[model samples]
Target: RRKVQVSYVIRDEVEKYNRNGVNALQLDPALNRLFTAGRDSIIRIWSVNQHKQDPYIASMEHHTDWVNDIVLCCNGKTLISASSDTTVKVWNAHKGFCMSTLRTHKDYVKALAYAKDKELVASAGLDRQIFLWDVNTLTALTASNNTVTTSSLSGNKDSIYSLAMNQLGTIIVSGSTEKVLRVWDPRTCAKLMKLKGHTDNVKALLLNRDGTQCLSGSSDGTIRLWSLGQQRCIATYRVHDEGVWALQVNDAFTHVYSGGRDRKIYCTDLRNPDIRVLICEEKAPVLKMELDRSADPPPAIWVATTKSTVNKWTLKGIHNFRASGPITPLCTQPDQVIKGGASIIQCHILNDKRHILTKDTNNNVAYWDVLKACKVEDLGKVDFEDEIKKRFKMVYVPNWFSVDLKTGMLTITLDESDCFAAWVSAKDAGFSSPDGSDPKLNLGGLLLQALLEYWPRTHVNPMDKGNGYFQVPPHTPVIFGEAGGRTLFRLLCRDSGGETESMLLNETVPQWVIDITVDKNMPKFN
Candidate 1:
């Protein structure tokens, strides 16, 4: 026998998506486009309306390092990107060409705020300063006009992280390294007043169309609403468990969406904020969020995170959204995952023993739910071990299963030993508790139920009076393949019990699986 090997590359012409996590995002509702800035030193344009078609339109490259922020102003006519390389860039919003690079600031450029009413923009960064540029000056910023400058709005002593300039072109507010916020008049380019209340630095700030009010997300884990006119905090929301990093308001000012270091995003009915809606939790730490009230049977919230991936989740119950106590999470899965192409590199098992954390070469971070076999959250590009220190809890769950991604995806290996290693309260494990009845649930119970959901027609639950059925999603596919080898069969999770497919299961059914799963009174989860 002769030994032989083949190596190859498939040549396909396509620009890359994000290679690292997204830092900021800009959405143009009228044009239905999305622009995302990433740690990979790249930017991309997406068509929000035609995700069913080809959502990705282009990937832009020019910035030398992390793109920290972006702004789409002038009715989507002009776009700007601020980068860690100490440059602010102007680009044609409709086209992906860089107009010019401005070394207007001395360090990593942090944020930009746009005021369309006056065709203006305010740029702030590590220089501990602010500058206002007339839209005309930026549009003329071709490489030839590289020396273009703006009037400075100064008085800041701390480096800024977020900026807000109202579309009404009256007020400018900044959430910076300071625990207190700085306010300004964009027109006069003068410092207005400093508002203080937050015990920690404000990471996200927004000024309204009216310019009389200001809203801030504080590192102290509070959402504070301020009457800039009165220079005091009017209302405070203490729901977020950690620092809120992103804040966005609706055009009508009726609602707001917030996301932060906590990894959860929420929508609150502003006037009666008691009623709330929890949007999806990120696979990573969220950095930015944009809500397009225009796109939906139920709109969409484009979530930018610490990792390369971006997620667009369903935004529901906005009008009738209210909550007094625990508000149920709207959806468990993202309707669309703006996929990131990064390979996870570092792995750590949590003290829980069932969940694991992973960081990829792209500097993206995420954790997995071993039992559910799903990536739980992506923490973005944070110091991996430091995050571990914060999340470490002295708690334990008996090992239920083993996990791996050597096959380049979440893979679980199970054997007869320790398969049912733990017992749980059915309700606590997310199983239905009928009439307040909490039954004993086996650790592997739900997984077994999910795997054999379409096993066989003859297999019936003992609890069923006669013949019964299990519901599986129609489009969900179950692959029967070899270990690091060839594919055997392809079938739907739904039609696995059909005549031809039913025979396929007969050959592969492990005796232990059939015995445990077909039990009449199995403690289960749905």
Candidate 2:
């Protein structure tokens, strides 16, 4: 045994003949009394101690329909019951008399609870509205039928099934048929948070002593423990085969008792949550339950059933249970999506604290305004596509050396020394060198040939005023001057007005190759 040890033995079975189903059960801590209300539309008050003849002390007959819920105020003097007659009736807990009626809800009042220390009562109904009432004003209105100031918290789209308030009364939480839970602040009458995860209607609710934790039972056959501060469900337990209808947390907040339509009563220890002990089993579904805090050392329970019967229980070995350890609160919706296409490589801070610079693998270095979630730009090389054209070119440009076409020395072949030898050979042969000796004869002349192939013009302009010219065709060989003097000429392409059209080239073209006569007296032609 390292398991949970619990004993829930039936001590008494109180039955009311010809009465309708029992729907709600509550114990008055201030008066040490128990109350039950149901489809009979009558609330029966009984003493915790049994009498020989009857345990029922009095009957309250203020409602005209099913009595759904009941709660007693802190003073032990007043009680309230929610009913399907579209009203909540106030009662004198000690004398069992009708005091006042709250007819604020337009439809059936499904659930209601009183904040004992704060003198406030909160109610919810099928009209999708929750009303907060001042108990002090409610006590005064019973004497004089006057209007009282009330606040209505709206936003629910479906009927609310259960409600619970904290000890301080500053906050109230409600569960609805929409399968969602909402927490509200009565001071501002605004919804503070929304908790969503349940798949069916929420049927019962219980809050821990300090209001930091909440327990909810739903029609989905599960009980969920929630952290009120974090606004999320912390843990879930499934012990019931059908819908759970009632829940009660012990005074020490160490264990919770759950009653379900599966005709089972389960006790779950918060500290050792892995173990669930079946404390009681019955033939009829348990509709309502309450822990009798006023009982002796071992305590007691009043379990109401759907067949108009109340089963009294004497519990043992409750104090021996230990808590399960520290609880880890979880967030239901804490993550956010940031818009970006690729993985970021690096990030840097900008001058302003609100802006930053991020670099990605796509060669994008962009400045972003973090606060505004946008991009900023500057004039610089951003990517390879827009800054350069045709990265791979046929002509290779060496990084270490700069080539010049002046003095006819722009060599296009593998080496410059071979081009000088070929020029000497062509000059000695009178520009008629044999092709067999120099298989690579174009080493000294390929520059001009490549240019002619690129531009594809009929003929280049005159090289100089001395009547030296060349055809644009690639196969034509170079011709020499008749005087045999080493002559140099400038070549240029121009239009009628002596203006040259600009062209962009990948490889650096020396200015000497495209000639320009410095002297104005010398004539130039295209």
lDDT of each candidate versus the true structure: 0.70, 0.58
Q: Which candidate leads the pack in TM-score?
A: 1
For model 1, residues 120-181, the per-residue Cα lDDT tens digits are 88888878988888877878866544666568987888988888888788999887777888
- Best candidate, lDDT: 1
TM match of model 1 to true structure? 0.62
> What is the overall TM-score of model 2 with all chains considered together?
0.56
Question: Residue by residue across 343-373, what tens digits does model 2's lDDT show?
Answer: 2344543322223454443456555432222
TM-score per candidate, chains pooled: 0.62, 0.56
Candidate 1 ranges beyond 4 A from true positions: 1-15, 50-53, 295-298, 320-327, 343-526
Evaluated at residue 231, the lDDT of candidate 1 is 89
> Candidate 2 has which clashing residue pairs, if any?
271-323, 271-324, 491-515
Error of 2 at 290 (Å): 0.8
